């Protein structure tokens, strides 16, 4: 009974494998072989934000492109002002072990979570004056790895129990559950439109989910080890994935396969973060060898290196206007690059 | 500039709260118990020990959260469940992000010849074979950055807290001695 299903699954997998090779007529390398390279992209630390006691595990920019929020394992969630280097807020957490932190598009709320298995939504406006936790969303059986807002009311969250969950903050119970992953889901990425999102798990597989329906449209394979960071190409028809096999890979949603691999012999260390530039022509990685490498998305060439962090670089975000890139490290320092 | 001045006063308050927290964070010694969060005092010394029973048995990711931790508390019950514990210790001991952390080992619930053929030619009895089997893993790839502290507990629970306090003192000592190149 199990033999028939397990053999039929192998047949379907081969049918999809042969279909993808039928679409692969010319590789991305061939098309972008006859365009001028970006050259040397050298960027220097414009600001150095300091105040975190412990390692900075995750950060996220605002839509204003001015404020950014950071999370550290000491138990502090600090909202900064990039331009002035002044601290705006500093929130003490109930659980010190925090692994993700999001900043609402409106800029009203701020989410965070970690090993406590719970996602905390904090209200900044608060007419009273003080910043207090608005709603505390519980349901996930494993640690919370990533969380990302759609509006003020709903939040998408991937946890380390092989499940991503769409929440409704108003009522405070799961609207839709996303199942399919076999390993811990490590990162999320929302498209320009809030219709689709992609999640990379610890099973060397990334999956494209439909928020409205709640089922996996496409499954992307090609990575050799656990996928840590995933990020949408600004267009929304491709995404880059950074794994522990020391390779970034670009996928195409319509092609439904791998386009290009961003690997170099010198790198034998895992990739923690991934983010595109405004135009998407650059792709900044950030490795656990204490530095970050800027790639040429189209040509697989290496443009430059952001070196300055002593310890592991855990998070890496670009602004909505794409003016600067902020990389957080286990140093306990943010650095703004321009 | 008036608004820049207004934002400095807010930054001034926040900075005054961080310096107070900084002292509290450095004072407290973090522990990691695996076989949630609990805070206890021993001779007016703050310890903050976090359990990991809520998570799954796939550790390879969330384990990385702990390296700021002072020392790991490892418990091993005495199928071949004993060998599964050795393999878990080896992994934590050899990990790239845990190659600085010490491990306080606790043997509780006190055939071996069947699951271990080296015991037949061992003479020093069963307790010290299981202790040594963990020490051979610790001495192989140590490098003098971290050590293992074995302990036998009948699981009575009396005088368990003091043992962890004495071991915590030894780890910070050795950590400083090596910093001053005096060890």
């Amino acid at each position, epitope marked *: 009974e199990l033999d028939q299903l397990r053999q039929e699954a192998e047949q379907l997998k081969n049918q999809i494998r042969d279909a993808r090779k039928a679409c692969a007529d010319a590789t991305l390398s061939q098309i972008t072989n006859n365009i001028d390279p970006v050259g040397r992209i050298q960027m220097r630390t414009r600001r150095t934000l300091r105040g975190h006691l412990a390692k900075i595990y995750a950060m996220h920019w605002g839509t204003d492109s001015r404020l950014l929020v950071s999370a550290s394992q000491d138990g502090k969630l600090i909202i900064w002002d990039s331009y002035t280097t002044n601290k705006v807020h500093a929130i003490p957490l109930r659980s010190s072990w925090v692994m993700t932190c999001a900043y609402a598009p409106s800029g009203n709320y701020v989410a965070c979570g970690g090993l406590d298995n719970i996602c905390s939504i904090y209200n900044l406006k608060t007419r009273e004056g003080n910043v207090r936790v608005s709603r505390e969303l519980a349901g996930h059986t494993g640690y919370l790895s990533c969380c990302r807002f759609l509006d003020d009311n709903q939040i998408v969250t991937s946890s380390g129990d092989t499940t991503c969950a769409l929440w409704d903050i108003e009522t405070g119970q799961q609207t839709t559950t996303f199942t399919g992953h076999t390993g811990d889901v490590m990162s999320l990425s929302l498209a320009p439109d809030t219709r689709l999102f992609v999640s990379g798990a610890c099973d060397a597989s990334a999956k494209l989910w439909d928020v409205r329906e709640g089922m996996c449209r496409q499954t992307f394979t090609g990575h050799e080890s656990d996928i840590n960071a995933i990020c949408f190409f600004p267009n929304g028809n491709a995404f880059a994935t950074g794994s522990d096999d020391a390779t970034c890979r670009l996928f195409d949603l319509r092609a439904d396969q791998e386009l290009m691999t961003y690997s170099h012999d010198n790198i034998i260390c895992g990739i923690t973060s991934v983010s595109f530039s405004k135009s998407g022509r650059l792709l900044l990685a950030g490795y656990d060898d204490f530095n970050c490498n800027v790639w040429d998305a189209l040509k697989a060439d290496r443009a430059g290196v952001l070196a300055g962090h002593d310890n592991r670089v855990s998070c890496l975000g670009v602004t909505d206007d794409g003016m600067a890139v902020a990389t957080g490290s286990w140093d306990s320092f943010l650095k703004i690059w321009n | 500039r008036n608004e820049e001045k207004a934002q400095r006063e807010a930054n001034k308050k926040i900075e005054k709260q961080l310096q107070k927290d900084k002292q509290v964070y450095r004072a407290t010694h973090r522990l990691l118990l695996l076989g949630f969060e609990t805070k206890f005092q021993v001779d007016k010394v703050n310890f903050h020990m976090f359990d990991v029973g809520g998570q799954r*048995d796939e550790r390879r990711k969330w384990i990385q959260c702990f390296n700021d931790v002072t020392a790991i508390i490892f418990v091993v019950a005495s199928t071949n469940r004993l060998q599964e514990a050795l393999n878990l210790f080896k992994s934590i001991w050899n990990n790239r992000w845990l190659r600085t952390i010490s491990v306080i080992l606790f043997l509780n619930k006190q055939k071996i010849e069947d699951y271990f053929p*080296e015991f037949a030619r061992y003479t020093t009895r069963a307790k010290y074979f299981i202790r040594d089997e963990f020490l051979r893993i610790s001495t192989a790839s140590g490098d003098g950055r971290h050590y293992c502290y074995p302990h036998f507990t009948c699981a009575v629970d009396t005088e368990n807290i003091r043992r962890v306090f004495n071991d915590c003192r030894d780890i910070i000592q050795r950590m400083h001695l090596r910093q001053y190149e005096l060890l």
Partner: nanobody
Amino acid sequence: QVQLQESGGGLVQPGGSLRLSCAASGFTFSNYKMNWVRQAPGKGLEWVSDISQSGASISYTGSVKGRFTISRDNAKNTLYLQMNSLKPEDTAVYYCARCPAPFTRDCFDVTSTTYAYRGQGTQVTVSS
């Protein structure tokens, strides 16, 4: 896609020999430390043996020590385990698993009962 297919497992007489083969594809074989794990009827997954990237560091469980021999071929992505003089307690489903990361000394979650980078598993029965 990471694939690990087990072959060469079946019904054998007690004191007989069996040779397991594990075909790997999707990942660079040489970079990863390869493992064998078995799950006996009505028991949990227990580690059996591992072999380093090159094939220098070789370690077993006391139960199979000096009776089982692990060997890896890099030229032909394949991991072998020669099983000599078998007894009924060896009767279990043997899986072929690799450590999650490449170029790593530590090997995590290989007996997790939900590990992704583990094979389908082959049946090995030792009966009269």
